[PDB]
Amino acid sequence: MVGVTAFGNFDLASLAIYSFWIFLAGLIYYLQTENMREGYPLENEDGTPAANQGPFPLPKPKTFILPHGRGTLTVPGPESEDRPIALARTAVSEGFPHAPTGDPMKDGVGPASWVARRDLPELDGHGHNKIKPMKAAAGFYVSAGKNPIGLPVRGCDLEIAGKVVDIWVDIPEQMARFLEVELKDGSTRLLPMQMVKVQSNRVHVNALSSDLFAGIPTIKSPTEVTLLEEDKICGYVAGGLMYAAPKR
Amino acid sequence: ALLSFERKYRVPGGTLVGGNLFDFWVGPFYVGFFGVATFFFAALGIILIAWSAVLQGTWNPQLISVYPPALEYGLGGAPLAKGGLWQIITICATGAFVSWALREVEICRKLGIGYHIPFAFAFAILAYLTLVLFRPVMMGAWGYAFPYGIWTHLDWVSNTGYTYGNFHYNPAHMIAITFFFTNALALALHGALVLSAANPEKGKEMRTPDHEDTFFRDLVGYSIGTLGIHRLGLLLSLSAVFFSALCMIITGTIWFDQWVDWWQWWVKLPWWANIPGGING
Amino acid sequence: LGYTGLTDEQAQELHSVYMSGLWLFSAVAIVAHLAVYIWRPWF
Amino acid sequence: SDLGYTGLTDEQAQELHSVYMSGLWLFSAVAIVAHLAVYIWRPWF
Amino acid sequence: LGYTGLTDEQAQELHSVYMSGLWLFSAVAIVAHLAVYIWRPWF
Amino acid sequence: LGYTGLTDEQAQELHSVYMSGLWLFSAVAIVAHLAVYIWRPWF
Amino acid sequence: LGYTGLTDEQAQELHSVYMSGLWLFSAVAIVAHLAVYIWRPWF
Amino acid sequence: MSKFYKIWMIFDPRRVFVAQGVFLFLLAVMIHLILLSTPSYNWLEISAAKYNRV
Amino acid sequence: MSKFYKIWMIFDPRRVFVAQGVFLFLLAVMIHLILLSTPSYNWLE
Amino acid sequence: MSKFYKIWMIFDPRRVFVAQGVFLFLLAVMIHLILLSTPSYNWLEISAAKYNRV
Amino acid sequence: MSKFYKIWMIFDPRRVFVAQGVFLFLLAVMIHLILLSTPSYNWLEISAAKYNRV
Amino acid sequence: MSKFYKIWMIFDPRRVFVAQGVFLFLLAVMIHLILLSTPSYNWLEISAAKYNRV
Amino acid sequence: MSKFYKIWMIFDPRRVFVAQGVFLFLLAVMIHLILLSTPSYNWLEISAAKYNRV
Amino acid sequence: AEYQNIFTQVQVRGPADLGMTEDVNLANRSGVGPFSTLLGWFGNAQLGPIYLGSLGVLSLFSGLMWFFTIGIWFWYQAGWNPAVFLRDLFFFSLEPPAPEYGLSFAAPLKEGGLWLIASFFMFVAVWSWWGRTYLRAQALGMGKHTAWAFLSAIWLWMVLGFIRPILMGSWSEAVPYGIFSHLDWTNNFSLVHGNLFYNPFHGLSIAFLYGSALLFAMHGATILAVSRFGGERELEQIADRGTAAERAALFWRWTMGFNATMEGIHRWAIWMAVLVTLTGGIGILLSGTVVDNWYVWGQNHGMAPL
Ligand code: BCL
Ligand SMILES: CC[C@H]1c2cc3[nH]c4c(c3C)C(=O)[C@H](C(=O)OC)c4c3nc(cc4[nH]c(cc(n2)[C@@H]1C)c(C(C)=O)c4C)[C@@H](C)[C@@H]3CCC(=O)OC/C=C(\C)CCC[C@H](C)CCC[C@H](C)CCCC(C)C
Ligand SMILES: CC[C@H]1c2cc3[nH]c4c(c3C)C(=O)[C@H](C(=O)OC)c4c3nc(cc4[nH]c(cc(n2)[C@@H]1C)c(C(C)=O)c4C)[C@@H](C)[C@@H]3CCC(=O)OC/C=C(\C)CCC[C@H](C)CCC[C@H](C)CCCC(C)C
Ligand SMILES: COC(C)(C)C/C=C/C(C)=C/C=C/C(C)=C/C=C/C(C)=C/C=C/C=C(C)/C=C/C=C(\C)CC/C=C(\C)CCC=C(C)C
Ligand SMILES: COC(C)(C)C/C=C/C(C)=C/C=C/C(C)=C/C=C/C(C)=C/C=C/C=C(C)/C=C/C=C(\C)CC/C=C(\C)CCC=C(C)C
Ligand SMILES: COC(C)(C)C/C=C/C(C)=C/C=C/C(C)=C/C=C/C(C)=C/C=C/C=C(C)/C=C/C=C(\C)CC/C=C(\C)CCC=C(C)C
Ligand SMILES: COC(C)(C)C/C=C/C(C)=C/C=C/C(C)=C/C=C/C(C)=C/C=C/C=C(C)/C=C/C=C(\C)CC/C=C(\C)CCC=C(C)C
Ligand SMILES: COC(C)(C)C/C=C/C(C)=C/C=C/C(C)=C/C=C/C(C)=C/C=C\C=C(C)\C=C\C=C(/C)CC/C=C(\C)CCC=C(C)C
Ligand SMILES: CCCCCCCCCCCCO[C@@H]1O[C@H](CO)[C@@H](O[C@H]2O[C@H](CO)[C@@H](O)[C@H](O)[C@H]2O)[C@H](O)[C@H]1O
Ligand SMILES: [Fe+3]
């Protein structure tokens, strides 16, 4: 039985607890610095570097090697929003909202914002397209639930906006990703599965009204979707929650 | 002041109450109406705890304790020096937690994301309320609720558990513990798997989720998936807290004996209740 | 300088009003403290 | 660069510091008044 | 190498101001130490 | 060599000024140790 | 074997300076051990 | 005190007013509760004792 | 009290009235409960 | 000493003012609470013992 | 010795100053608390002893 | 001996300096606390005993 | 043993230096605390007994 | 009324995914098992394939021997009575040898030897499974984070069953193999060492178990809330930050004042989880070997009134 104290009340338990406080301080520093590889250095609302950068310095850069010859990403690195953000500030001082200049859902700001991702399709471990339509997906079929092929699609304004013609599937994860909806104009749109509500007789889309499925961004190739395209589509649909409220 | 991508998201709207009066940011924080409510409640509670430290006569943060009123005060107020400070800190904390969840709802609405986070926090708040409000109300005294001290709410846990013997034998307690342990295991596995895919051995290309699925199918023959793992983590945490609240709501109100005796119903089933041998027989 | 966007005359006027409110508050506080002091002195 | 992380110039910084020092001296003088008052009422030394 | 991006003269000026602040702080500290020690020495 | 991207001249200057700071610290430490060992020796 | 990339010549001077530090450290350690053993031996 | 008005060229009133209201109400509640906690200045209990209401 | 009208140049009344009503009602409830807590004014025995 | 104004060429006045306002308020409330803790300097306690109001 | 300006070629002044402010305040508070916990150097208690304030 | 400057060819001066500062502060605080925890060397208590403070 | 320098061919010097430094410091404090634990080597208490400090 | 993304509403099945053959001996990998629609409502519907190498079969057979040894002891305790076996299943216990045997291996089978046999089997099974996790990570070229995260839990397990019994000088200190039995052991361990609540490392371990629950709720809820932007595909968000990662970061930035990245949140996760068992093992190692009454230690270290 140890328990001899070297001084005061400082036995081995005290040594251990103070050692753990030191280790925890170091670990929290390490975790916080490792979580500053994106979004830094901090910027003023005009995009210039801010005077206050915080107690934690930025970490040393590290490079990820992308898996299909897609390149190399070094973080933290230079950061620039490669798109024309259409907002104007509502106050000269900091910490106030920036109002849209025009149509926010169309311009892609606020809840409708999208990020200028790489304009290439997501590639699985075999280098093929990860997300592809069920038609091109060999041997892929609906296993459970109501198969939503030909179900009318209802918007938040409670009117039919089109019919589902296909399901886009993530091949390795073997899960549904997008519904392809053909509108009244004969053109096609993609809708994320997370924002549709498949039901007994119809696919409900609470995010968008009927007169908004035309505004959904399209895919240049009809049998594939790139990261940028799906980012734009998902941003549009999600922004419909705030910006289609006036309709419903 | 802002992240490099933050500006295109700081648009007006999404506010539950107000809309311009409290629709702005202080530093990084979004200040809604519920932001003001939360800040006031938190500051009042913290300075009241400091005041109770002054009253108690100790400046040790570990020794500071704010006991609820004694049992003879019932469900009524008490002098600030005796039991009233606890009740004020309790209403302050309840308001702070609820307004924090509502502020989260406002932030979710502004960002156009789901409301999962405030819902989970609501589970946590409901467990807290079970411990401070619902159970003491059903037992008719604020004195059953735990004190607000670092090492004295542990004494509350100890005394409350030992009132019923070994508290391990509460079956809902067993289920909640299973969920808690499973959740910690799953969190370790998820962090490890994502980090191992994103940090391959040495100068190797970053791994795809196919490699994650392959790793876990190789290991245990199943892979719940990238979406399934986050569903599982959320459900494990929420079920853990739900069964914690359930186990405490039935203790002292539906069950009053030693919890171990509750298991006798299995050993007394008539077909085998009187077979000699084993442990109970 | 020049953060909030208010000009010098606007700041002057706003601060004059704000100091008026501060002094109204302080005078009512003085009357309250005088009443308490004549009722129960703390010194 | 020490030529200003905040973007202020020497004149703006000097004037802002003058007003801040005036406020600090006001606060410190009121504090000295309070300290002398309490010490005469009940000294700690 | 120089990581802060300062110039040598900017570092000189910043150091002079900082050392002035440090010497003022240490002077007030020395005054406090002398006062306490003559009042109640610890040696 | 060539791990922090420093050259011999700046590394030498940095080392010299660091050694100067270290010797200042050590001299003050030795003064404190002499004072204590005079006041209450531990050997 | 570019395991570290050192050119087989940097490693020489690196080892020499590290050995200098090691010998200084061990020499002070030996002096300390002699002093404590003289003060009261542990054998 | 002449140039203190320039504080309103540093801070937007829409945030300083919210901060000031929160602060003053909080300080008021803290002081009132501190007085009510000590029996010496608990006005309700002083009144209960004076008027033999216990 | 003359110039205090400029306060509506700063804050939108359509929200300020709601916020102030919430505040005053909660202050009322706090005072009611505080008098309840002391035994010499609890009117709900 | 004369060049201390350059502190504002390194630190943003809004951040500094908020920080030192919170710091001074917390320091003052902590010192007052420390005094209220000590019996020899709790002004309320000294007053109540001065006028036999217990 | 006088050539210690070059630290500012190395360390960012803003982080150094905020860290030093925190360090100085915490060191001062710790030393004041060490004295307050010592009966022979608690100034408030020494005053209470010399002026019979108990 | 004289070649030790190569330490700055391997390790970033910023990391070394901050690590050394933290280490020295913690070591000094620990040693002062050890000496303050032994009545043989607690200079506060020693000076209390020297002048009959208690 | 002459060719021992080739160890830096395989081992990264930064890792070895940091690991060895932390290991030596931890070993040193462990031995100092072991000595402080044994009253036969607590130099503080040895001096206390020798000079009748307590 | 809105889809919360808790259960998939349409399941899709394609050809069986055999996985990535980085360095995996395809001989050891079994065939793809069945597809479970019940499991598919929540995650992947596919079962298997499972890899079975040297360490896999070693661990599987060693664990089978451990489980079978405990079960046969339980059957013996039931008097070979299936009704008694079902009635007292949770009450049976394979107990370690009595304290008078110390660490010796000369205890009778009924009084501790069978516990030693089962303990050896469990030791082999767990360490072979650890090596198996390391090797499966290595075969796919991934990092070894799973192995070290497992090593933390292995350290708590080793302290409980192996290291602390050796330090305390007897196998009787270790944990019995039984459902209610090891709960009784836990409660008695707390009682003997004087309210383990006052063990600082028990307190930290609980802090981190609560923190793991908090953090996995936060992370799962955050990813589900941004799954409408493909947020659950976290690796691509690490490689090419989309609007899901930005919205998650900004949610927690505007709520807490600070945030994580898609990659660093998993560092938070792994450390929060491993600290549970790391701190817990330290505390259990200290209990008895250094401190035998944690309440008195608490009192002497603040934490409790004298
Ligand atoms: C009356 C009981 C005592 C008490 C006595 C103890 C004792 C004794 C211990 C704890 C420990 C802990 N206590 Mg406690 N504890 C009490 C009250 C609490 C309360 C509460 C609110 O009251 C909580 C939340 C906790 C929580 C905790 C955890 C933080 C900690 C357990 C960590 C863990 O995950 O181990 C679970 C994980 C493991 C044991 C490791 C598992 C890894 C191995 C390798 C698994 C292999 C599986 C095996 C081979 C079988 C395979 C199965 C098949 C493959 C399917 N205690 C009271 C005061 N507590 C433990 C601790 O960490 O101490 C500080 C511990 O030893
Ligand atoms: C339901 C699953 C788990 C969970 C989930 C969860 N917790 C959450 C969230 C979620 C999803 C948030 O979004 C929210 C958050 O913002 O996280 C960073 C939060 C949060 N969970 C927190 C803590 C927390 N969660 C816990 C538990 C859990 N949280 C569950 C296990 C615990 C435990 C088990 O002890 C703690 C300590 C906070 C970090 C944060 C909520 C912050 C908040 O409410 O802010 C407003 C309030 C304050 C700033 C403080 C108010 C202080 C009072 C006025 C005075 C003190 C009162 C208190 C009762 C004293 C206690 C004394 C002693 C008991 C110590
Ligand atoms: C960071 C700490 C947390 C943690 C982490 C953690 N655990 C881990 C890991 C990690 C990181 C792994 O990598 C490893 C793993 O593989 O996870 C899936 C593991 C693991 N943690 C496990 C359990 C576990 N972890 C726990 C706790 C925790 N784990 C902590 C909370 C607990 C608790 C709370 O008690 C348990 C019970 C396992 C799932 C696994 C280690 C598996 C192992 O060692 O297996 C050995 C096998 C046996 C001893 C049992 C054999 C049983 C059978 C008889 C085998 C034969 C079966 C037969 C062949 C079937 C035939 C079928 C056909 C007939 C159809
Ligand atoms: C438990 O152990 C105890 C506590 C008992 C004993 C242990 C004690 C220990 C370990 C003590 C350690 C003490 C130390 C290391 C103290 C260090 C103190 C220092 C370094 C204080 C420095 C103070 C410096 C100050 C106050 C400088 C202020 C400067 C200004 C206010 C001016 C700033 C403005 C500038 C620089 C503008 C310039 C800008 C341009 C662009 C030129
Ligand atoms: C439980 O055991 C106990 C604690 C009782 C006993 C154990 C004791 C132990 C283990 C003690 C260990 C002690 C050690 C290892 C102490 C080492 C102390 C050292 C190495 C201190 C070094 C201090 C160095 C200082 C203060 C250097 C300061 C340097 C400067 C200020 C120079 C500034 C740098 C500049 C200007 C670089 C800019 C130049 C250019 C060209 C940019
Ligand atoms: C529990 O068991 C107990 C503790 C009771 C007994 C067990 C004791 C044990 C197991 C002791 C183990 C002792 C061992 C293995 C000690 C190993 C010592 C070694 C390897 C020492 C080597 C040291 C090298 C040193 C200290 C180098 C020092 C350098 C300086 C002091 C000057 C700084 C210059 C450097 C670092 C080189 C600069 C040049 C460049 C290019 C960086
Ligand atoms: C536990 O230990 C105890 C507490 C017992 C003892 C320990 C005590 C300690 C450690 C105390 C430490 C005290 C310290 C460091 C106090 C420092 C106080 C300072 C630096 C106060 C400074 C105050 C400055 C003030 C109040 C200035 C106010 C200025 C104004 C109100 C004017 C507004 C400013 C404007 C308008 C700027 C000009 C704007 C333009 C556009 C030109
Ligand atoms: C019909 O049923 C049949 C018979 C077919 C199968 C049924 C089986 C049954 C009923 C199995 C029941 C199993 C149970 C109840 C298992 C419970 C296990 C529990 C709760 C274990 C809990 C903790 C165990 C720990 C902490 C073990 C730690 C062990 C170590 C750390 C390694 C120990 C190694 C030692 C002591 C040294 C061994 C080495 C030698 C050379 C003896
Ligand atoms: C929080 C992390 C930072 C911790 C401080 C940095 C140094 C790390 C090592 C510190 C180790 C010594 O830490 C110090 O140990 C002594 C041992 O009696 C403790 O003990 C001292 O204070 C306590 C509490 O008043 C007394 O009951 C005790 O008699 C007295 O000796 C100190 O309270 C503690 O501060
Ligand atoms: Fe994740």
Strands A203-204 and A152-154: parallel
What are the phi and psi torsion angles at L2 (to 5°)? -75, -20
What are the sequence ranges of the domains in chain F?
Answer: 1-43
Structure-block tokens of residue B162: 């030992």
Place of tokens 């003289």: G38
CA of K42 to the centre of ligand 7 (A): 25
**B106 and B9 housed in the same domain:** yes
CATH class of H5-51: few secondary structures
The CA distance from A111 to B9, in Å, is: 7
Nearest ligand to the C-alpha of residue M37?
Answer: 5
Inter-chain touch N180–B169, beta carbons under 8 Å: yes
CA of A193 to the centre of ligand 1 (A): 40
H40 to chain A, minimum CA–CA distance in Å? 40
The CA distance from A152 to A135, in Å, is: 20
Residues 6+ apart with CB under 8 A from N89: N74, N179
Residues 6+ apart with CB under 8 A from D42: J41, J46, K51, K53
> Ligand 6 pocket, G17 CB below 6 A?
yes
Tell me which of N66, N155, N177, N184 to substitute to probe ligand 8's pocket, judged by most ligand atoms within 8 Å of the beta carbon: N177
Burial of E13 (0-12, 13-18, 19+ CB in 10 A): middle
CA-based max dimension of chain E: 50
Say whether N254 sits in a helix, a strand or coil.
helix
CATH for I5-45 (3.40.120.10, 4.10.220.20, 1.25.40.10, 3.40.1180.10): 4.10.220.20
Taking CA atoms only, the protein residue closest to ligand 6 atom 23 is: G22
Mutate to test the interface with J, among K18, K36, K44 (most CBs of J within 10 A): K44
CA terminus-to-terminus distance, chain I: 44
CA-based nearest residue to B136, from B176, B86, B172: B86
Q: Are E3 and L14 in contact (CB under 8 A)?
A: yes
CA-based nearest residue to N132, from N26, N50, N56: N56
Check whether domain A104-244 has CATH 3.90.50.10, yes or no: yes
R_g of chain G, CA atoms, integer Å: 17
R_g of chain E, CA atoms, integer Å: 17
- From J5, J41, J46, residue closest to D13, measured CB to CB: J5
Q: Are D6 and K15 in contact (CB under 8 A)?
A: no
L25 to chain K, minimum CA–CA distance in Å? 10
Structure-block tokens of residue N182: 């090891």
Q: Are N170 and N295 in contact (CB under 8 A)?
A: no
Residues 6+ apart with CB under 8 A from A17: N200, N201
CA-based max dimension of chain H: 57
B90: containing domain: 1-163
CA of K24 to the centre of ligand 4 (A): 6
Cα separations in angstroms, B5 against A82, A98, A203: 10, 14, 34
Chains B and I are touching, with contact defined as 3 or more CB–CB pairs separated by less than 8 Å: yes
The CA distance from B116 to B113, in Å, is: 9
Structure-block tokens of residue I29: 């409830």
Q: Are L43 and E42 in contact (CB under 8 A)?
A: yes
Q: Which chains touch A (3 or more CB pairs under 8 A)?
A: B, C, D, H, J, K, L, M, N
Interface check for B47 against chain J (CB to CB < 8 A): the answer is yes
Structure-block tokens of residue K36: 């307050």
Q: Are N203 and B62 in contact (CB under 8 A)?
A: no
Nearest ligand to the C-alpha of residue J1?
Answer: 4
Q: Are A162 and A216 in contact (CB under 8 A)?
A: no
Residues 6+ apart with CB under 8 A from A240: A105, A112, A156, A207, A208, A209, A212
Q: At what angle do helices B85-111 and A227-243 cross, to 10 degrees?
A: 120
Taking CA atoms only, the protein residue closest to ligand 7 atom 4 is: J31
Structure-block tokens of residue J36: 């209220």
The CA distance from B131 to B146, in Å, is: 7
Cα angle A78, A81, A82 (rounded to 5 degrees) comes to 105
> Ligand 6 pocket, G18 CB below 6 A?
yes
What are the phi and psi torsion angles at I15 (to 5°)? -100, -30
* Count of residues making up chain I: 45
The CA distance from B89 to B41, in Å, is: 9
The string of DSSP letters for B95-147 reads HHHHHHHHHHHHHHHHHT--SHHHHHHHHHHHHHHIIIIIHHHHTT-GGGSPP
**B13 and B93 housed in the same domain:** yes
SS3 assignment for chain D: CCCCCCCCCHHHHHHHHHHHHHHHHHHHHHHHHHHHHHHHHCCCC
Cβ contacts of L6 on chain G, cutoff 8 Å: 13-14, 17
Structure-block tokens of residue I45: 């025995």
Residues 6+ apart with CB under 8 A from K48: J38, J39, J40, K54
Say whether B25 sits in a helix, a strand or coil.
strand
Burial of D16 (0-12, 13-18, 19+ CB in 10 A): buried
CA of B27 to the centre of ligand 7 (A): 21
Query: Into how many domains does chain B fold?
Result: 2
In a domain, B273, yes or no: no
The string of DSSP letters for C1-43 reads --SS---HHHHHHHHHHHHHHHHHHHHHHHHHHHHHHHHS---
Residues 6+ apart with CB under 8 A from A28: none
The CA distance from A233 to N243, in Å, is: 11
Query: Which residue type sits at I27?
Result: L
The CA distance from A245 to B15, in Å, is: 13
In the 8-state DSSP scheme, what is residue N9? S
Taking CA atoms only, the protein residue closest to ligand 1 atom 21 is: B157
Query: Which residue type sits at B133?
Result: L
Inter-chain touch G4–M8, beta carbons under 8 Å: yes
Strands A160-170 and B24-26: unpaired
| Closest residue on chain J to B58 (Cα) | J37
Cβ contacts of M14 on chain F, cutoff 8 Å: 3
> Ligand 8 pocket, N158 CB below 6 A?
yes
> Ligand 3 pocket, N213 CB below 6 A?
no
- From N86, N87, N257, residue closest to B27, measured CB to CB: N257
Residues 6+ apart with CB under 8 A from N78: B277, B278, N84, N85, N88, N92
CA-based nearest residue to I12, from D18, B177, N305, B33: B33
Say whether A142 sits in a helix, a strand or coil.
strand
Residues 6+ apart with CB under 8 A from N123: N162
What are the sequence ranges of the domains in chain L?
Answer: 5-51
- From H8, H10, H41, residue closest to C14, measured CB to CB: H8
Inter-chain touch G6–M8, beta carbons under 8 Å: yes
The CA distance from C40 to C38, in Å, is: 6
The string of DSSP letters for H6-54 reads GGGGTS-HHHHHHHHHHHHHHHHHHHHHHHHHSTTS-HHHHHHHHTT--
**B23 and B124 housed in the same domain:** yes
The CA distance from N126 to N131, in Å, is: 9
What is the Cβ-side half-sphere exposure of residue L51, based on CA atoms within 13 angstroms?
13
CA of C33 to the centre of ligand 3 (A): 70
Helix (H) or strand (E) holding N11: strand N11-13
CA-based nearest residue to A218, from A201, A205, A230, A206: A230
Q: Which residues of C4-13 are buried (b: 16+ CB within 10 A; e: fewer)?
A: bebeeeebeb
CA-based nearest residue to A237, from L31, F35, B114: B114
CATH for D1-45 (3.40.50.300, 3.90.1150.10, 1.20.5.250, 1.10.1520.10): 1.20.5.250
Which residues' Cβ are closer than 6 Å to ligand 1? B 157, 181, 184; N 126, 153-154, 156-157, 160, 186-187, 189-190, 196-197, 201-202, 205-206, 209, 276-277, 280, 283-284
The CA distance from N82 to N68, in Å, is: 16
CA-based nearest residue to L6, from G12, E4, G25: G12
Q: At what angle do helices B226-249 and B171-198 cross, to 10 degrees?
A: 160
Q: Are A68 and A123 in contact (CB under 8 A)?
A: yes
Place of tokens 């609560």: N210
Q: Are A207 and A241 in contact (CB under 8 A)?
A: yes
Which residues' Cβ are closer than 6 Å to ligand 2? B 38, 41-42, 45-46, 89, 92-93, 96-97, 100, 104, 117, 120-121, 123-124, 148, 150, 153, 237-238, 241; N 210, 213-214, 217-218, 221, 255-256
Resolution (A): 2.8
K50 to chain J, minimum CA–CA distance in Å? 11
Residues 6+ apart with CB under 8 A from A41: A49, A50, A53, A58, B4
Q: Are N229 and A194 in contact (CB under 8 A)?
A: no
Query: Where in chain A does DSSP place strands (E)?
Result: 62-65, 72-75, 87-89, 98-100, 131-133, 141-144, 152-154, 160-170, 175-183, 188-192, 197-198, 203-204
Q: Which chains touch J (3 or more CB pairs under 8 A)?
A: A, B, C, D, E, H, K
* Count of residues making up chain H: 54
Q: Which residues of A28-46 are buried (b: 16+ CB within 10 A; e: fewer)?
A: eeebbebbbbbbbebbebe
> Ligand 8 pocket, N122 CB below 6 A?
yes
Query: Which residue type sits at H46?
Result: I
Say whether A190 sits in a helix, a strand or coil.
strand
The CA distance from N87 to A184, in Å, is: 67
Cβ of C3: how many Cβ atoms within 10 Å? Answer: 16
Structure-block tokens of residue N81: 């009575």
Cα separations in angstroms, N92 against D28, G7, N84, N157, N207: 75, 67, 10, 21, 33
In the 8-state DSSP scheme, what is residue A82? -
The CA distance from G27 to G33, in Å, is: 10
Place of tokens 């930290």: N204
- From B11, B225, B227, residue closest to A110, measured CB to CB: B11
CATH class of G1-43: mainly alpha
